[PDB]
Amino acid sequence: GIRMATKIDKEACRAAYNLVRDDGSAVIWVTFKYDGSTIVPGEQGAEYQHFIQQCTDDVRLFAFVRFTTGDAMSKRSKFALITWIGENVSGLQRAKTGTDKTLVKEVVQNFAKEFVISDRKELEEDFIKSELKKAGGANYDAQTE
C-alpha cells in the first residue's frame, strides 16, 4: 500500500544547502524537487526574478532561500523554506506535502521559518520582506547612546 517509509537524499540536498548556507555564496536560492519516495535538489540561482518564472501550475515545489533579516548593531541572516502549492493541485497531493514538510525540514533544519505560497502576487519578494519581518520580530527603541 502506502506506508510511512519515505526518505530524503540528504547528501544531494546537503550539496545545495552547503552553498545557500554561506552568506558569500552567489547562489542565494535553491529548489527542492521530489522523486520516487525522496526529496532531491532542484534548480539554483542568485536572482529571484527567475524564481517567479519557475513557479509552475499544479506541481508542488519547495525552495530554500538565504534571506537577510534581524536588526542589530551586527548583521544577521536566515533561511526560508518556501512551499509552492498552486490552487489547481488537489488536496490528495497537498496531503503528501503536509507529511513531507517534515522530510525536507530534516535537511532544512538550518532555517528560521517556513512560508507557503499559491499565487504569483503571493510569491513577490516585496511584501514577503515585511511578512518575514512580522514573522521574524521587531523593536523600535533608540536611547542609552
Curated annotation (Swiss-Prot):
A GO cellular component entry from the record: extracellular region
Resulting phenotype, residue 134 to E: Abolishes 5LO-binding activity
Locations listed in the record: Cytoplasm; Cytoplasm, Cytoskeleton; Nucleus
Species per Swiss-Prot/TrEMBL record: Homo sapiens (Human)
Pfam short name (any one): Cofilin_ADF
Region feature Flexible and important for F-actin binding, mapped onto this chain: 69-78
Keywords of this entry: Acetylation, Actin-binding, Chaperone, Cytoplasm, Cytoskeleton, Nucleus
Tissues expressing the protein: Widely expressed with highest levels in placenta, lung, kidney and peripheral blood leukocytes and lower levels in brain, liver and pancreas.
GO molecular function, one term: enzyme binding
Segments forming domain ADF-H: 5-133
Principal place of residence: cytoplasm
Name recorded for this polypeptide: Coactosin-like protein
N6-acetyllysine modification, residue list: 105, 129
